[PDB]
Symmetry: D2
Subunit: 121 residues, 4 copies
Amino acid sequence: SLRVEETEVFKKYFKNLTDRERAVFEGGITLGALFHQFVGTPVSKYNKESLERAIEEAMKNQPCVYDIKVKIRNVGEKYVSLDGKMLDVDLKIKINKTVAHLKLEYIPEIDYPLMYVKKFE
Amino acid sequence: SLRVEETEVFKKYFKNLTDRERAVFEGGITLGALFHQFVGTPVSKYNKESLERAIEEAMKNQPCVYDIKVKIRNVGEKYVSLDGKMLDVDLKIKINKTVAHLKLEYIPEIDYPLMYVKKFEE
Amino acid sequence: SLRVEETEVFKKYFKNLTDRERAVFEGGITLGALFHQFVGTPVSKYNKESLERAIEEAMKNQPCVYDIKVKIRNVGEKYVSLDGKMLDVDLKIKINKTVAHLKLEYIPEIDYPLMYVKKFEE
Amino acid sequence: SLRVEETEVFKKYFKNLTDRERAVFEGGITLGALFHQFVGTPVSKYNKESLERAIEEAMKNQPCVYDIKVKIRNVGEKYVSLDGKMLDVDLKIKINKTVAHLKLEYIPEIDYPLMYVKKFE
Ligand SMILES: Nc1nc2c(c(=O)[nH]1)=NC(=O)N=2
Ligand SMILES: Nc1nc2c(c(=O)[nH]1)=NC(=O)N=2
Ligand SMILES: Nc1nc2c(c(=O)[nH]1)=NC(=O)N=2
Ligand SMILES: Nc1nc2c(c(=O)[nH]1)=NC(=O)N=2
């Protein structure tokens, strides 16, 4: 693997963290990165699928990302600027034997695109 | 279609420009938009193609975009944040019978990712 | 100055445009750039002014920007992600003796954050 | 406080995490968000100070951000697009009594803008 997280120098900066702490830290980075990188992107039914695929594949690059699935909700025939409330993301981060499952989704009750941890394996 | 630029309300805001002025204005918006939307995006050989394709299809949504081709240069096995100097873009804007062909490419002599107009068809 | 648009290499890429065409092309670049760079940024009354000022100064770097004023509308005590429909921008582009005045503003009738040219000053 | 993270609904999504896990999760979001929001921004000596201040004030809005300091390195008279390797960020996240101190900085040895946790209190 040519991934930077495999290097000894990278690893030395995470000796103060548990594997669970590392997993959610890395998960947080990726969800925050995803949101801010892509919000604003013109999106319509025409490019929905290509956008979803590109976001998944782009973010897969980042440290410790094991798998990811991206859905864009409420996409219309007329294009709009992507907004955070339209994102529905499932993310898996793997740190050694620990897998964190994280979620980005719109929570109506707080009118907020919330990022959180679903569960650990 | 449902495209915003077809509405009479949209059109009334551009009665003060020539078709060449409009084409170049719209082309400028789209090149600025794509640079600033996508710079920063993680890119490797893994996602080079889906990223190129998604940029093309996203930008096609915008007013008056006739066609667009996006190439990301110097992509390796190891990922990097997309930077503007890696972009090589050919864009076509159509206003009535006027077509502006615009370019985004790296100019080594000024170390600059330059946006310009390649040619018109009128 | 050290501004890239002052170099001969840069200039040689714009021989095919009138000054008005060049002004609106550069204006389109800056508006598209501003919109896509900053949409998404957390904004509340807390940081409204610093964001407005940072956007103005950042965009002043770009080729041929003469002046810019950025207002963010509908900012509350609670933060939101900056949305394009909240931007109200007046931009001046100067090419030799030509000044293009451009606008970004929300048009309720088409539910669209519209970029257009107000006027030229010659 | 009108902050969303103070609401009961928000809080119920984090019962599965320790305060340290929460702090690094929230810290990770803000650093990934900051990087991807601002990378690409035109920056020169002219607007360096206003850009740093705006980044600091913007990101302070986010859940659980206690304090933040943003420095942009190697800024010249001629503008460049902000590059992630130019960022030098110190970030404090507070969850109840737990404070996590996080860092974004360029690590020459792996040519990487690394995000990591410096320490907890
Ligand atoms: N738990 C969190 N969820 C978020 C967030 C954050 O800082 N924390 N920004 C966001 O858009 N969703
Ligand atoms: N002609 C121009 N080329 C540019 C630019 C601009 O404002 N004008 N930004 C950029 O990245 N390339
Ligand atoms: N005239 C235009 N106004 C726009 C636009 C575009 O491509 N053209 N995108 C946008 O957000 N506002
Ligand atoms: N520890 C990490 N540091 C990062 C990163 C990531 O996913 N993890 N992206 C980045 O630019 N710096």
